[PDB]
């Protein structure tokens, strides 16, 4: 006894784009928290953007209540002004 | 946008809703004091038009346009939970009124509960039937839910139809008990607590039955998937809330208060 | 929609004297209302 | 008798039930005494206490309701 | 599963409704209305009702609901 | 009654009002000290060019900030609750008087022995006798025996009122269908004034209370003369 | 375009703007009402009429200041503008429902002004106690229009509370825990929980009053076995939480302003400040009967309500001391917003302490329904809630508008208001101790000096309100455009510029774990 | 905060006009009502 | 019945700039005009009713 559509058959618009991206392990709509690198100049945190700048929030140490916010610009890696952690924009 | 949230198209329904509230309140004032129903009937009409178009647009945005990502659905889940909590606290005020009056009956009542000259309904007659009906509807709506998750269109429809039929049965039984009751809303605090508490509950049963009927027609139109059906979950949560309020009324007003 | 200073508001700030008139009418009507309601109650 | 003494059944600021109970007790005792044709003077304590505690308008309203047949307490 | 909740719907829930419907059916029929007594805590009228002649409750039943002055 | 430029409580006429004055003195000292300490610490934080803007550890100091206030509240609660229970204590009154609130006057009933009742209305401003107080005098005062425990019972026959006599520490709400009890004991003869203390409509400002405290023998003859 | 933008909004900033305009207009109404009160009391005798016209003015004063000025400005205005920006969210969870929360308020306000125009008004007090508020002592439409006003404001705030709780729980960056959200965001979430739980109980109570008035119910009428004191319990079950609703967002704004103008990256003792606000919110539900110490409740009940009420001083003290510890070591900027916030810390403390005096049932016998209560609540509302609103307004006006205020004028405004509110309310302590009742149009002659001084104070506060309108005009008239804002690294709401674009965070913030 | 100089400077005379007009908009209507109370 | 959701998805995603409350076609405009006319007319009538009730 069937007759109920599935998300695979009937999901549309952004719901479907999220569904199809997650099957491929991709996160274009920023649903997941990114995992930090070591954050050195050699191994900077890689920050995707669809433009040439994005706001970073840096939780410098685990369980800090204070988030440090700054614009990251296309070009050379920038550093969190509190902890010095490196971030690089990947547009 | 590279987030998952819904930027809603500019909408007139918030304003029409706000104005329908002005027309219903000013309309009730005009009915209670100036002997006229005109404003009130305009407000009830605009309120129904607003609800229809607003929830229609929510279906357009979700089923037809795909804006209900998991993040959006999670927000609607919280919204409906919070709305149900607010309705619980509303009923809590009426239960407080009931216990206040009944635990310390004043001399005007004869210093007893039920008051002198009050002949309560037998809780083992229609009130017990109404209890069986709402509990039964809690079982059938659960059947409907599992049918939908298992992808069974025919059994979802049959279970949901049974659930609506029981909600209608309860409403007709309560209408008949209202008509047959030898006491009225003007029979002191007994009538006051009985009719206002059971009356708001009856209104919630009608609202919940309307929501289930909306889910029934959306199901007929294939709107729900086996995994995405928040309107059905929300109607089911609301329907359990209505059942649980009934169980508290039955125990408090009908049984303990008899 | 227009963005930026003086454009994210439902009133115009293009002319400071027209703005003074609009603000005068807006805050002035709020402040006046209770005096005129009291006058209304006293005149019944 | 000066006034109604402290009654441990009614120890709080709300004395409504104290007035009510003593009014009931007087009228129940009076009915029991008029019935067997006994003496209403055994009822005197209840009479003094309710007269001390109860507002005149309450007693007046209750007496009117006993005569009307609309008094809601059991006598 | 759906199968179990259907089993409960038809095997327990609707049989209960059927039995309570029987119970109510058997105890229906008009019981005899009590002597009218004009108790002041009942048939309250502080303001006329906004319908009818102002003196009838909304679901007034002439058989069992006396007015302030008694049964109609 | 209050006098011009008064800062504090009317002088105590009853032992419980005396107790409330001493309890208020103790509480006010605490309010003064905490208000003063906060203002002084604000002014201390704001009067140095020295800086320290790095993260500050909170937990040690939060012990002081919670314990010291907890101790201070206990030092208020102890005498507060001793007085609460002292007013509630069983006392054996010699006399019961009822007052009924009305729009806009008080009625009094003394029904221990005879049916004595009367209405008590404000003296209009234009009818004051020389030396009498605007908005405070009544035609018929509540005559009571001094140095005797009196049970006052308070109700209303219309809307809420509240029967208050500040110098005796008294305020009891007047609620229709309810009989509220308080006790009154005046250490002194004299005239003790109060004012309706629940919003009750057009003349809420204009239904005062005047107690007249006299020796028992005078109260008895007055009672007899008022039947 | 104009209708689509301002009547059909789904934008958190524009809706915040609508709330601030609405609240500003409401503040002018509430100010006029406050001056009529003080004009009546400014010399012995009768100015306007008897207690009915007077108490219509007093009642409307309270409803307007609470429901149309403070709640719309703090929650609807600052909450809608700042909450999404402070969590990097693109809007509220329910951007269309948000617009209905706003548009319910003009009609709510219209019903209150209708109450005052029909018959003789609702001269009930803002508590609307029966039987004075009943259909015998207040026959006709006035009280029903007041009830309906409260119903619409109730629905507005309930739907607003659902919106804020959902937004704050569901729409933060996925790496951001609740313990990485700013204190203002916490203050709004807790306020929203209080609204969600308290307003439905008010709705139930005023609905019972509506049915007693119009459908011959007797919830509050002893003739039917009802009890006027039941209404008081239902009202105050809402009413005590309501005062915490009025101050909590003010606490949140004070934390931000003190941190900012101390040159600090963070408030002292963040988790203590979260603990304190949650504690105050919880304790605020179990104390309501401190509004009922004279109604005749049992001694043990009075003992419980005394004790439970005093407990609130502990978490409140942690916040006051944490604000002082935030100032400690700061590079202090003596901005106008900092002046408001420092006035807040001191004057809120004084009103909180007179509240602890009132918490003592035995002393409350003599202080209840006197100007001592009026002094307590105007210290916490007219010098607490209002100082936090004025501080927040001057601090964030350049974010909202893209223009600067004249700081010298803003300091003048602060100085005048500071003198006027203290001159108004400090002497009311003396009137309370010495026994002057509440809701009086006239007083025994002994109370004349302090009533005279209080009324003179009210006129100074009027001068400050008039100057404030001029100061806002001068800012829009001059058009000084914002360039740089300091401390954006710990104040995300500023990082999109002044004003921010209509759409912010279309691309969300990057926050890693 | 830093800001640009005023795009449309408000001179002392212009400020006196704005302040005067603001104050009159509060004071004249209330003053008219209170002056006429006796007549009401 | 048959599943015609795909045909409603095409209609409501059509690139025509209409807001969702008008995107169904001419019937939406009619029901919008009826709603807003009753609301605005009703509100003007409520103001007339206040004017009337404001005097004895
Ligand atoms: C009891 C009631 C409760 C009262 C509450 C009052 C508060 C309400 C708050 C909401 C404010 C209203 C805005 C939305 C609707 C208004 C519609 C309208 O006509 O507006 C014209 C008017 C502005 O006129 P403008 O300058 O010609 O228009 C510029 C447009 O860009 C150009 O637009 P356009 O060219 O396409 O068309 C504009 C045109 C026409 O626009 C349209 O097409 C609109 C048509 C339908 C409008 C329906 C809305 C009605 C308002 C709802 C509330 C009632 O407008 C006009 O010029 C004529 C309109 C005349 C009607 C005036 C109504 C305004 C509010 C009334 C105040 C209270 C009255 C009560 C009286 C009491 C007596 C007892 O808007 C306003 O009223 C805004 C407020 C007035 C200025 C005050 C400034 C104070 C600054 C304080 C600082 C606080 C903010 C800090 C942050 C700042 C940075 C972000
Ligand atoms: C900007 C502001 C613009 C102007 C504001 C309005 C100005 C009011 C003028 C007050 C002057 C009164 C006067 O005629 O003084 C003569 C008066 C004559 O003395 P007295 O007749 O021997 O009175 C002593 C009382 O018996 C003492 O016993 P009592 O039982 O008669 O005393 C109770 C009384 C006593 O309280 C007072 O005397 C209040 C003093 C206020 C301190 C400033 O009232 C209070 O409890 C007031 C409650 C206040 C709430 C908490 C205030 C927190 C304090 C803030 C700390 C900042 C300090 C640095 O001298 C004073 O005590 C000065 C006041
Ligand atoms: C913003 C509004 C607001 C706030 C926050 C408060 C906060 C408090 N209020 Fe108040 N209150 C009102 C608004 C408010 N109130 C209103 C409007 C009324 C009248 C209602 C009506 O009848 O119309 C009223 C009435 C009212 C009454 C009833 C009085 C009566 O009618 O007889 C009482 C009784 O306890 C009370 C107490 C308190 C207390 C204990 C607090 C506490 O939350 C205060 C806590 C703060 C502090 C104590 C200061 C800071 C602490 C320290 C520096 C630490 C050290 C302190 C100690 C050791 C004591 N208030
Ligand atoms: C928020 C609440 C609040 C505020 C701010 C005030 C402010 C004032 N109040 Fe009142 N008042 C109450 C709430 C408030 N009040 C309540 C609840 C009662 C009890 C009612 C009852 O008994 O039923 C009361 C009662 C009351 C009485 C007692 C009446 C009586 O018992 O007979 C008096 C007497 O003087 C008084 C006076 C004033 C004065 C002179 C001010 C002045 O300080 C006001 C000065 C002006 C302002 C403070 C500006 C306000 C405007 C803004 C902040 C807009 C800002 C604009 C932008 C940000 C763009 N009020
Ligand atoms: C089968 C159950 C379904 C209920 C449907 C019945 C009627 C219409 C609306 C119902 C809404 C529910 C509650 C409102 C209050 C009262 C009605 C109680 C239920 C009822 O219907 O009670 C009847 C009385 O109705 C009366 O007065 C009727 C009065 C009609 C006008 C109601 C006034 C509206 C009140 C305003 C509501 C405010 C909402 C608050 C929102 C909260 C916002 C924060 C009982 O009849 P009776 O003849 O006295 O006794 C029987 C004797 N044979
Ligand atoms: C005679 C009585 C008159 C009184 C007036 C009230 C009368 C009737 C109201 C009945 C309520 C009907 C509500 C219909 C909602 C339909 C829209 C809907 O259900 O929308 C759903 C979202 O839920 C959502 O918004 C959830 C939205 C929930 C709202 C429900 C609220 C109950 C409302 C009560 C309102 C008044 C109560 C006050 C009483 C005092 C859409 O998402 P999905 O379902 O996942 O679909 C998408 C999938 O297809 C993708 O594959
Ligand atoms: C005396 C008479 C006074 C009565 C006054 C009546 C007042 C106003 C008239 C109301 C008109 C209602 C019109 C329909 C409103 C539907 C709201 C709704 O359903 O809101 C939803 C959110 O609330 C949610 O879910 C969960 C919440 C749904 C709430 C539905 C409406 C409730 C209105 C009454 C509530 C009273 C509370 C009773 C308890 C005291 C959707 O949010 P949107 O922002 O639209 O969309 C977001 C998009 O992503 C969707 O695709
Ligand atoms: C789309 C908008 C265009 C249409 C506008 C709406 C026109 C409606 C006008 C009719 O007015 C009505 O007239 C009735 C009688 O004149 C009233 O009943 C009243 O009088 C009845 C009998 O006369 C009583 O039975 C009722 O209790 C009582 O409310 C009724 O209330 C009132 O509404
Ligand atoms: C009542 C208000 C008074 C404010 C009191 C605030 C006290 C703050 C103390 C915490 O700051 C500390 O200062 C030390 C250097 O001196 C540091 O080394 C230490 O690491 C740091 O934590
Ligand atoms: C609480 C807020 C209010 C605080 C006090 C307000 C201060 C008063 C501002 C001036 O108000 C005006 O005063 C005039 C008198 O000075 C009035 O003219 C009246 O008196 C004039 C002189 O007798 C006549 O020429 C006019 O016709 C006559 O209307 C005029 O109407 C009124 O607007
Ligand atoms: C989209 C636009 C919105 C539509 C606005 C419609 C406005 C026109 C409504 C007609 O007005 C009516 O006038 C009747 C006068 O004939 C009133 O009758 C009522 O009042 C009468 C007055 O005598 C009484 O006979 C009765 O109470 C009753 O019939 C009734 O109150 C009122 O409705
Ligand atoms: C024939 C039709 C098919 C639905 C479909 O697959 O499109 C069936 C499936 C389930 C049926 C419904 C359910 O069986 C429950 C109801 C049973 C009643 O006997 C008729 C109405 C009733 C409400 C049915 C109407 C209709 O015949 C439905 C909707
Ligand atoms: Cu009687 Cu106030
Ligand atoms: Na006066
Ligand atoms: Zn960092």
Author numbering:
A (entry chain F): 3 to 93
B (entry chain C): 4 to 261
C (entry chain L): 3 to 46
D (entry chain H): 11 to 85
E (entry chain G): 12 to 83
F (entry chain B): 1 to 227
G (entry chain A): 1 to 513
H (entry chain M): 1 to 40
Quote the paper.
CO2, N2O, and Xe2 were all bound to a common site (site 2) near the branching point of another hydrophobic channel that branched from the O2 channel. These results indicated that the affinity for CO2 and N2O at site 2 was higher than that of O2, N2, and water molecules. The hydrophobic interactions that sandwiched the ligand between Phe67I and Phe68I may affect the stability of ligands at site 2. Under an N2O atmosphere, the activity of isolated CcO was partially and reversibly reduced. The O2 consumption rate slightly decreased in the presence of N2O. Although the binding of CO2 or N2O to site 2 does not block the O2 channel, it may inhibit the diffusion of gas molecules through the putative CO2 channel.
pmcCytochrome c oxidase (CcO), a terminal enzyme of the respiratory chain, catalyzes oxygen (O2) reduction coupled with the proton pump, generating a proton-motive force across the membrane. The electrons from cytochrome c are transferred through CuA in subunit II and heme a in subunit I to the O2 reduction site, which consists of heme a3 and CuB. Cytochrome c oxidase (CcO) catalyzes oxygen (O2) reduction at the heme a3–CuB site in the transmembrane region of the enzyme.
